[PDB]
Amino acid sequence: GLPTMNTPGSCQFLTSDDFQSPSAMPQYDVTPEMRIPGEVKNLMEIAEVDSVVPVQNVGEKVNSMEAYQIPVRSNEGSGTQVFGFPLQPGYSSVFSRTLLGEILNYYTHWSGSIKLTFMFCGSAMATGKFLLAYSPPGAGAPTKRVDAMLGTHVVWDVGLQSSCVLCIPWISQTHYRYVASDEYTAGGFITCWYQTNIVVPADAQSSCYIMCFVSACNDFSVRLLKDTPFISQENFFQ
């Protein structure tokens, strides 16, 4: 009869506890393992994979493959804005439903760099240069290419290498950021501008499309696990 004494916490069921429980099926022989391809070991192996970003949310294109297409056209001037969305991988309607944004919605904090791979889907005869830029928060979003200028940019020349990767660094006051929005934890703006208008020959289409892909860099990490707001339920499914 060993003298024991209980501490607060006895007979409590903590959802996230880690204890040993007696097996209900003793000496049960588990069917031997099999090497099945593509095993996941960490959720970041999945967030490091490019997934097409629905930049053109706009209207009913969200109910289509058009959400995925970024319209590019031959103008009568350069410096025009192609697109613009804020750096909120788990919050912005653009990123929230990406492979990266879905995983990020199960966590409260996040930290790291992100790769935005842009692929030009025009004719093999179309040319053009684009200014892909990321401007940290502090002063509003760049409204001219001349304001996007001063930011962290990458001039993309369309050629044989269809795609160009604008890599967004981690420039933050804090170590992590909230997955949900908070202006303390503000992220910045990603904009695209024509550097030199789209030039096409005669008989080739002048309006093309670009596609954007989002993946995490080797320094990306998510913290504090919570439930996604993306899956609801009214009754047990039957």
Ligand X SMILES: *C(=O)CCCCCCCCCCCCC
Structure tokens at 14: 């903590």
Q: Report the nearest approach of another protein to the CB of residue 234 (Å).
A: 7
**Nearest Cα residue to 196 out of 98, 107, 101, 128:** 128
| Shortest Å, Cβ 175 to another protein | 6
Considering the rule CB under 8 A, would residue 177 count as an interface residue with another protein? yes
**Cβ-proximal residues to 222 (8 Å cutoff; 6+ apart), any chain:** 43, 44, 47, 103, 104, 106, 107, 109, 110, 111, 179
Q: Per-residue string for binding with another protein, 23-62, x by CB under 8 A? A: xxxxxxxxxxxxxxxxxxxxxxxx-xxxxxxxxxxxxx-x
**How many CA atoms lie less than 13 Å away from 87 in the CB half-sphere?**
31
Q: Is 220 near another protein (CB under 8 A)?
A: yes
Q: Which of 58, 74, 78, 76 is nearest to 66 (CA)?
A: 58
Using the minimum distance from each CB to a copy of itself, give the nearer residue, 22 or 229.
22
Smallest distance from the beta carbon of 197 to another protein, in angstroms?
8
Which of residues 4 and 15 has its CB atom nearest to ligand X in the complex?
A: 4
The token duo for 154 is 């990458």
- Is 20 a binding residue for a copy of itself by CB under 8 A? The answer is yes
Site for another protein in 151-170 (CB under 8 A): 151-170
Note whether 140 and 183 are within 8 A (CB): no
Residues 1-60 interacting with ligand X (rule: CB under 6 A): 2-3
| Residues that contact a copy of itself, how many (by CB under 8 A) | 36
> For a copy of itself, which is the closer residue by CB, 31 or 218?
31
Helix or strand or coil: residue 229? coil
DSSP β-ladder status, 189-196 and 129-135: antiparallel
Dihedrals phi, psi of 145, to nearest 5 degrees: -65, -25
Select from 115, 80, 110 the least CA-distant residue to 191. Answer: 80
Distance CA 222, CA 183 (A): 19
Selected binder of a copy of itself within 127, 152, 197, 221 (CB under 8 A): 221
Residue 120 in the binding site for another protein (CB under 8 A): yes
- For residue 42, the minimal CB distance to ligand X (Å) is 26
Q: Which stretch binds a copy of itself (CB under 8 A): 28-36, 82-90, 97-105, 148-156?
A: 28-36
Show the tokens assigned to 20.
């040993």
120 binds, among another protein, a copy of itself, ligand X, none (CB under 5 to 8 A by kind): another protein
Residues that bind ligand X (CB under 6 A): 2-3
Residues that bind a copy of itself (CB under 8 A): 1-14, 16-26, 28-29, 31-32, 174-176, 221, 223-225
